[PDB]
Symmetry: C3
Subunit: 173 residues, 3 copies
């Protein structure tokens, strides 16, 4: 198992999330669909790597936990390294595990599961991929000690500003 | 190769399905989308395990078969044990096989295919997963000899009424 | 590793694509959904094999490339042989690699990545699957030397006319 951590951050500049409201209730419900796309940074918050991209399908409102259950299908883009694909539960109200369905580039053959940690709605999430099946060891620029997750985390000013020292080459946008 | 069978049943108490009707045609056609969530029971019908949850994309009406072709992306939830994800053909008029795209929990690393039997369209479905890649033998409460699939199958009265003896631990709802 | 190549062609007879417009923009943007289904032929263009079926989710318009980034979830159908499932990026203006999420039939246990080549927008596409995990060698009727992809390629007359000699058995339609 090779562990890989990343932060997903919504910077309010990619028109995301887009809510397609089809359930008649004022709350989320079955029928509602949410395409989305956020920014992706290294687990140490030092570099911009790319984006997340996909779709959340609303399954049910959970009024007792003041939250929503989604079923999610989406990918994680790492510039020229390639991508990882996932499929599973996305709960606004608690942490979950999603299936790693595959990948490409350095992530060709990837399998296992990924932990998703909800930090701040709708702006900050943290992930740890428990990666099996890769052909090589992950590149060192992706495997720095992660910053421990909290509501207060922020990307390095260099990474937010897209300075040469704060991005990977051909990071996805 | 480890066999796992489950019964999916639509008890019409989960606001499911929700039909999003967009096609040019009066009948089902490309453009139509069907988000869904049904209840899930063990192969021996003794216990409630959880739910199914996902999306069917209508591909074409099949007038010579008196039904429809769907392309389906969905997950199967097993309370505390984790989940299994699938993709592939959902045909209203005949049995099909879907790809197992991955899993999480005891289903971390899952691969193979699953047989979908259209027992009573659209209310009762019976599945048989041909599961490879699991870390360990499946828990016994999930592997009781399945009840042979027939039109009049019913869950155990305790499974239906959610009594301790008829539910798995923290079964998905 | 077993290579498999196929041509996907929109022959304008399958009601496809169907654009579902929700972005408040004159161009494609997040919220736009595109269900689709095209015809599939062998890499040597000698036989009709089946169809593609699935969904493209618009991520963003890409002004400087005069095109779009989609996130795509779809299957490849090969008649009685089975199906492959994929997830990943679909860029209208350049080639990409997608993840092979799984398979059924002869493709039970498939994994790896697939190269998508944008030949003529959006009507002809050429794919090469880099297939791992198959239980057996691929059938010879599927592994003829591919015709090198070009704007001017065409299926064999026998294939287009649906003669027994130009189709696989029970080719998907
Ligand atoms: Na393997």
């Amino acid at each position: 198992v090779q562990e890989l951590s990343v932060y997903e951050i919504n910077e309010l500049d990619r028109h995301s999330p887009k809510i397609l409201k089809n359930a008649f209730s004022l709350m989320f419900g079955l029928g509602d669909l949410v395409p989305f796309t956020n920014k992706l940074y290294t687990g140490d918050l030092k570099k911009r790597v790319g984006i997340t991209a996909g779709l959340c399908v609303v399954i049910e409102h959970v009024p007792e936990k003041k939250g929503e259950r989604f079923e999610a299908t989406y990918s994680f883009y790492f510039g020229d390294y390639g991508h990882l694909s996932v499929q599973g539960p996305y709960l606004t109200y608690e942490d979950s595990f999603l299936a790693i369905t595959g990948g490409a580039g350095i992530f060709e053959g990837a399998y296992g599961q990924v932990k998703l940690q909800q930090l701040v709605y709708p702006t900050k999430l943290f992930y740890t991929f428990y990666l099996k099946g890769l052909a090589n060891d992950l590149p060192l620029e992706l495997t720095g000690t992660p910053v421990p997750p909290s509501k207060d985390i922020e990307p390095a000013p260099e990474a937010k500003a897209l300075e040469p020292s704060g991005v990977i080459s051909n990071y996805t946008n």
